[PDB]
Amino acid sequence: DGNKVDLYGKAVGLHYFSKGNGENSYGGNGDMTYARLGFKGETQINSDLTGYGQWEYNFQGNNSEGADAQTGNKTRLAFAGLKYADVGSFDYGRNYGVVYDALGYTDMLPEFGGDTAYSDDFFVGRVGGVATYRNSNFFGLVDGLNFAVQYLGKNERDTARRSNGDGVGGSISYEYEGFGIVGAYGAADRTNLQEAQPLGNGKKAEQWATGLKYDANNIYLAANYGETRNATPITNKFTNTSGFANKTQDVLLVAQYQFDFGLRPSIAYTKSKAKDVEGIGDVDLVNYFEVGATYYFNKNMSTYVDYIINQIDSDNKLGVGSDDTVAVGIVYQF
Amino acid sequence: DGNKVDLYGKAVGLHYFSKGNGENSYGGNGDMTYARLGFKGETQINSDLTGYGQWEYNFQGNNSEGADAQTGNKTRLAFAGLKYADVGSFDYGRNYGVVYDALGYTDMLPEFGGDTAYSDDFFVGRVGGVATYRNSNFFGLVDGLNFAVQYLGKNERDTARRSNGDGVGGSISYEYEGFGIVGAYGAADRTNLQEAQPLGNGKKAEQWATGLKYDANNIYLAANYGETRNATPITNKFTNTSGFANKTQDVLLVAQYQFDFGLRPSIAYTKSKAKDVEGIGDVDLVNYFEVGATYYFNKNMSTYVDYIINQIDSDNKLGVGSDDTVAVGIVYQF
Amino acid sequence: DGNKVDLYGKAVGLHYFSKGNGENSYGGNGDMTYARLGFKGETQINSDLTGYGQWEYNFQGNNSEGADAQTGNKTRLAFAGLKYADVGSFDYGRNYGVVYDALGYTDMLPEFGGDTAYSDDFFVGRVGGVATYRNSNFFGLVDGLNFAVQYLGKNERDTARRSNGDGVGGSISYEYEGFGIVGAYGAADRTNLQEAQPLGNGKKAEQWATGLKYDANNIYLAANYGETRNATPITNKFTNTSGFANKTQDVLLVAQYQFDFGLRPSIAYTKSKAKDVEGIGDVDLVNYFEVGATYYFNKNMSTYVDYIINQIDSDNKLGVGSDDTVAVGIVYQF
Ligand SMILES: [Br-]
Ligand SMILES: [Br-]
Ligand SMILES: [Br-]
Ligand SMILES: [Br-]
Ligand SMILES: [Br-]
Ligand SMILES: [Br-]
Ligand SMILES: [Br-]
Ligand SMILES: [Br-]
Ligand SMILES: [Br-]
Ligand SMILES: [Mg+2]
Ligand SMILES: [Mg+2]
Ligand SMILES: [Mg+2]
Ligand SMILES: [Mg+2]
Ligand SMILES: [Mg+2]
Ligand SMILES: [Mg+2]
Ligand SMILES: [Mg+2]
Ligand SMILES: [Mg+2]
């Protein structure tokens, strides 16, 4: 009856290599195997109207069958919506925060990358309780011009890190001839639990980002810049103190090429600097170069290596790990 | 070849609006998105015999991807059985309590309702370890006459609220010309842990209900009345004390219409009164009117609003919420 | 596009009968209902090369929908790999040890059996972080001659029971005209947390087993013999101390017949004895006879009974359970 639903997923055999047991590395050390399961469906309601829904789950494959069986298991996405011919889509539930419309540009590495797209972090990553309106080609009048607004409902959780107040954010993008340019901005109230943390001071959190990319002829090139206020979560590893960076400035870059025979090498740089952090001043949160590659056997099977050359120094005042990490992956997906 | 199984699910974007906080409301306040996933299968073994099984899970969509990720996640149903031609069906596992053959009559609202069909609550909701026998049209000899019996095995759990002793229950119903009537009753042993609770006293739990319904010509009218002894779970928020109501008296009413263009308005009333509650006597547990509507775009897509006009008063002796609660939902299902 | 993926699972209505709880039985008492869900996929990359992946999850059906909802839920398998023409298969993730290549011989009972194939126990059961290479028919040159090697990456977990160090293990088998013979062995480092336990002492865990089987003409006969040194997990029930048996010796015998009409009687014997147990000396871990049966209605539906005649005596120095257990099961699978 014009419903299309496709159960999807992957099994990801994954191993991280880092110094020691990886307490002072970028990614850690050991087994990091996991699996994904989801559905994605879409129903033709009439000529002009589609309904749709999606759910996606993370099942870790590197816990025992003992008491730790559920460590890092979670729902990543859960949302439903309606899409109306020449007017836009509207969805609600657990979904990507708008500002990920910009950060998605550089979140293209075989394993790492994407460092500033925190989950449960306002308009940066996948969160809870968002209403999202999206528009393609400006109601159909302007090919390549897209925009979105997103309404974030307050989530007063048990942890400051996973909480938020009410907020609004949005995004505008233009694509033309393989190039793409995009800007995204959100702000939200911070909750009383966030204000009580040692790190971070202010009533509102803000995040913004811009992106430029070239995505054509088997070349992928992209850059993202942005900044945040009272929005980037941080932990002092020395004091076990936590909260949010009063300011960050963040800059990511990525260069890839896709060979017809399956190989797709990747080169990147990422740097995120916190400022005005209490007791500290300026610090680096992320600072690295990346070399990697993915080999695609076909649409269902790939392998990959991903090497993070970590520029964080062993000095780092927040305890951010300074050692390198290499990831090795085998993936079956459907 | 012989076998039919169909993966099923829904994604529900869901939001509740109450004063506060929602501490003092019927339903709470904020994001309540969730998803469901299940399978349902039937195999033709021969001409007279079919095997079947069902599993159903709830994935909350309004938790973070942190330490609270698993909150409210659970298996709803997990059972397997055989259905023999003129004998009946026999199944075992986690399934609906028998007395829910009565309560289902009124559990028909867009979001709320069904207030007395508690889970893990002897016979009124989905419970563990039930062997259920069911019969259609009295061995095929009496059109519209159905019955069932169910054996509940002891579950001594860590919690009095989620426990039970051994029990037996059943249900009888007759349907004719769009009308339906149905009686159900179960009784069981209480566990020591339940007897140790300050609220509620008795060796035995009991629950019964009767149902009346009209279900034709696009009209749905239904009413349930019931009582319980030592069965309905309760809390006194003034004392942080818990247990079970020595007695309750329960009445639910529902009226709905289905318009061919998809709109289905709903009107309801629910009162549940506890009696003989230690240090209190009588006290309402539930008391409200409902108005709502579901808009069905088709078999896969729907939206709804449900408004609960809460008649509980701010003097209620157990601290039961007195504020209403409006729910708004968007549903993709397959 | 040359991909075949099956979603699969089962619903198992399951009940165990034992004296009392029974806190002193082989298997326990009460509702043991569960379900499984998994996918299994295979993609033809080219005429000589296949990709594959598998995920499998256990969903308990005997928990309430309260705080205990998650007890016993776990990923059993999560792996992906490549299979090349005659050269062999390579996979990584959570998978069966390499010593279960032998123990699978007798792990054939309707419900029980398989006592020495502990999960998260080096090479005997399902684990986390294994790299497994497998070869059939010695590169296509010797019909019926198969072998495998497996590399076990260290998992330092919160618990001694679920930890391992790095190890290697392997297996070799040979089948000809319904007869089968197998040998398997592995060794790995113990972790410091393991060595810190009062029970067990040694740098290295080791496990080995051999198997003979006849599997033809509806007869199934199999035997396994095995030993372990610092690998088999134990608890002293009197003193509440835990660790690993310094040694064990294990025998598991099985006989079954498959009638064409669906019945499949089973008879078994299992004994595992620990030696050099701190504070104790020699003591039986498992000692029983089995007598059960499985009735297959078809490929999707079965029932079974499994009766374990426990020869553990009430004298057991470790407090191992001595009473019998009977299981009754109903299974829908797809
Ligand atoms: Br995926
Ligand atoms: Br994160
Ligand atoms: Br559903
Ligand atoms: Br029920
Ligand atoms: Br309703
Ligand atoms: Br409930
Ligand atoms: Br299965
Ligand atoms: Br191909
Ligand atoms: Br185990
Ligand atoms: Mg773990
Ligand atoms: Mg502060
Ligand atoms: Mg600030
Ligand atoms: Mg460095
Ligand atoms: Mg009492
Ligand atoms: Mg009121
Ligand atoms: Mg020791
Ligand atoms: Mg005995």
Curated annotation (Swiss-Prot), chains A, B, C:
Annotated consequence of substituting E111G: In strain: B/r; AA sequence
Cellular location(s): Cell outer membrane
Induction per the UniProt record: By growth in low osmolarity conditions (low sugar or salt); activated at low osmolarity by OmpR, repressed at high osmolarity by OmpR (at protein level). Levels of OmpF protein decrease in a lon/ycgE double disruption (at protein level).
Ranges of the Extracellular topological domain: 18-32, 61-76, 95-128, 154-165, 190-204, 230-246, 276-285, 310-324
Main location: membrane
Matches recorded under Pfam families: Porin_1
InterPro entries: Gram-neg_bact_OMP (IPR050298), Gram_neg_porin_domain (IPR033900), Porin_dom_sf (IPR023614), Porin_gammaproteobac (IPR001897), Porin_Gram-ve (IPR001702), Porin_Gram-ve_CS (IPR013793)
All ranges on the Periplasmic side of the membrane: 1, 46-47, 86-87, 136-143, 177, 217, 260-261, 298-299
Membrane disposition: Multi-pass membrane protein
Molecular functions per Gene Ontology: colicin transmembrane transporter activity; disordered domain specific binding; identical protein binding; lipid binding; lipopolysaccharide binding; monoatomic ion channel activity; porin activity
GO biological process: monoatomic ion transmembrane transport; protein homotrimerization; protein transport
Disruption phenotype annotation: Leads to decreased susceptibility to a number of hydrophilic antibiotics including ampicillin, cefoxitin and tetracycline. Deletion of ompF confers resistance to colicin E5.
A GO cellular component entry from the record: membrane
Subunit architecture: Homotrimer. Forms mixed heterotrimers with OmpC and with PhoE; other mixed heterotrimers are also probable. (Microbial infection) Trimeric complexes with colicin E3, BtuB and OmpF can be cross-linked and immunoprecipitated.
Domain notes: Each subunit of the trimer has a water-filled pore with a narrow, elliptically shaped (7 X 11 Angstroms) selectivity filter which has a solvent accessible area of 30-40 Angstroms(2).
Protein family per UniProt: Belongs to the Gram-negative porin family.
Matches recorded under PANTHER family: OUTER MEMBRANE PORIN F-RELATED, PROTEIN YDDL-RELATED
Protein name, as recorded: Outer membrane porin F
Organism: Escherichia coli (strain K12)
